[PDB]
Amino acid sequence: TTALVCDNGSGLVKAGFAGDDAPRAVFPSIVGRPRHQGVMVGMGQKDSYVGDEAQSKRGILTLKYPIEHGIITNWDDMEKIWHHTFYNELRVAPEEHPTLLTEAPLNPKANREKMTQIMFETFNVPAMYVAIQAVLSLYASGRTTGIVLDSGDGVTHNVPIYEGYALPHAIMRLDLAGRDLTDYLMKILTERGYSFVTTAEREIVRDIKEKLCYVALDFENEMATAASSSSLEKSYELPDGQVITIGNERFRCPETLFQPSFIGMESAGIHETTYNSIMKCDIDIRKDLYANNVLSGGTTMYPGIADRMQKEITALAPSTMKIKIIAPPERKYSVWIGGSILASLSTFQQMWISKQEYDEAGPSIVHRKCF
């Protein structure tokens, strides 16, 4: 039999089969409901659209995300998401397939327990397993040591691993990610008159971010370059027409990752939490960690982010070590790729949580050595 690999993430569902090179179903993790009245009798319209259909009916729906920061907040919505993923995108019967789920470090425990309970009671899968996103990223990267920085859409986290041993006291988790970058871009785009307030203009702003934003290698020099020239100013065409022109806020948006004070957060940038995780690890694995700094997740896809991260970590660490940043082109799907590798490993077929184990030990069996 084959196992499914559902990388829920927070803002993009990625599912597929264990043993493939890529997911076969990538769609947004949104659930939309109509907000207007509806006049044409016989239209027979539905009450809630899931996934990629909601993005077509944006102008009529209110789009809600069922996952805020890794954490699931709307369990009925999330159950709809899973039902859509199993039956409409993949077209499989979940009572014949083990399912490997992913989760971020340092989430509530009820999240994981309720996820297991759903997967066994509602969808009736034979086995299931919840994996950490950073470990799976390291599987897909081909390493066995290295400090991984998995910046998704809800959370950002560093997880240092050495020789296959993870150092839990050095795990860092930050709640700044692509969703906060989108909100900051919505906010600073009002300096030029453009206003995006609806829950469906957030998708337009996310598209603008993905297509035009980039990380500056030096922030003050790019500030001055934008103040003087106009060579970095680019245009974008809305779904309506009426092109908008983006100036220096092409690189002020992702700079929030290195200066979280822009959105009023207290914490330090990703370049500094990475270094603090290093310095919290031992002394005789720090050289390997410096040399194996692995990036994954969608928020690491900006142009120039690897070069910026290297410049910063190099200015932080001692001057005698080679600091190297691994940033594959298929970063966004690294967690899923690693999940497929892991679930196909023949050694892993004894780590599943079978259904009988659950029936006899309750949902608490998730936090056991299968953690």
């Binding site: 990625k14 090179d21 890529a22 997911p23 076969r24 179903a25 990538v26 769609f27 691994i326 594959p328 082109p329 298929e330 966004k332 799907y333």
Partner: protein
């Protein structure tokens, strides 16, 4: 046997292309983990034999594209990975030509 002289010619040249695959040379990039070709001459001649473009085959070996849902994203490769891919390609094309030759033989024999 039933098959023409052009077909024997193509068989021989295909085997020579398989032979030309082995001498390809790849190096890591400047400050990255990506494979890039340094020697291009055997690449050019193997492409001229195979009926493909040399730059296009080199790009297809260094930067595969995979399907993620409804989009294509480029996958990264290092020297070991591209070498394993080259070997698997050669084994595949050889075994394919072999099976098809057996099909041709059986078609000749067929009553």
């Amino acid at each position: 046997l039933g098959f023409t002289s052009e077909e024997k010619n193509s068989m021989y040249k295909l085997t020579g292309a398989i032979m030309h695959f082995g001498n390809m040379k790849f190096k890591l990039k400047q400050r990255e983990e990506q494979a890039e070709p340094d020697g291009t001459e055997e690449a050019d001649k193997s492409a001229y034999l195979m009926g493909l473009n040399s730059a296009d085959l080199l790009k297809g070996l260094c930067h595969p594209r995979v399907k993620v849902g409804n989009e294509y994203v480029t996958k990264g490769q290092n020297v070991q990975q591209v070498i394993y891919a080259t070997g698997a390609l050669a084994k595949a094309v050889y075994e394919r030509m072999f099976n098809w030759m057996v099909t041709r033989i059986n078609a000749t024999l067929e009553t």
